[PDB]
Swiss-Prot record, chains A, B:
Gene: atpF
Domain of life: Bacteria
Family designation: Belongs to the ATPase B chain family.
UniProt protein name: ATP synthase subunit b
Localization, UniProt: Cell inner membrane
Stated role: F(1)F(0) ATP synthase produces ATP from ADP in the presence of a proton or sodium gradient. F-type ATPases consist of two structural domains, F(1) containing the extramembraneous catalytic core and F(0) containing the membrane proton channel, linked together by a central stalk and a peripheral stalk. During catalysis, ATP synthesis in the catalytic domain of F(1) is coupled via a rotary mechanism of the central stalk subunits to proton translocation.
The organism of origin for this protein: Escherichia coli O157:H7
SUBUNIT field: F-type ATPases have 2 components, F(1) - the catalytic core - and F(0) - the membrane proton channel. F(1) has five subunits: alpha(3), beta(3), gamma(1), delta(1), epsilon(1). F(0) has three main subunits: a(1), b(2) and c(10-14). The alpha and beta chains form an alternating ring which encloses part of the gamma chain. F(1) is attached to F(0) by a central stalk formed by the gamma and epsilon chains, while a peripheral stalk is formed by the delta and b chains.
Length: 52, 52
């Protein structure tokens, strides 16, 4: 009983924390790519504006 | 012991997952939102140089 209970609390906590972490990662990635794409959009508008 | 630990753990798992999900929706959602933004602005700029 004692052992199991300890495992329950600690483990669940850890997992959830992990979930938080991963979410943080993916979100960050989204931020980065979004930035990058955004940059691309910028560049395209550039070349276009130029040639025109 | 069994009842309490198990219940806490389960409700926990579901909840954390939910959180991470809301994260994902907010991340892709926010991200796409960013995308549309990029479109609008870039149009505006092309307009700028064109005006030039």
């Amino acid at each position: 009983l004692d052992l199991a209970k300890a495992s329950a609390t600690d483990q669940l906590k850890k997992a959830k924390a992990e979930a938080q972490v991963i979410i943080e990662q993916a979100n960050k990635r989204r931020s980065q790519i979004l930035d990058e794409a955004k940059a691309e959009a910028e560049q395209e508008r550039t070349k276009i504006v130029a040639q025109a």
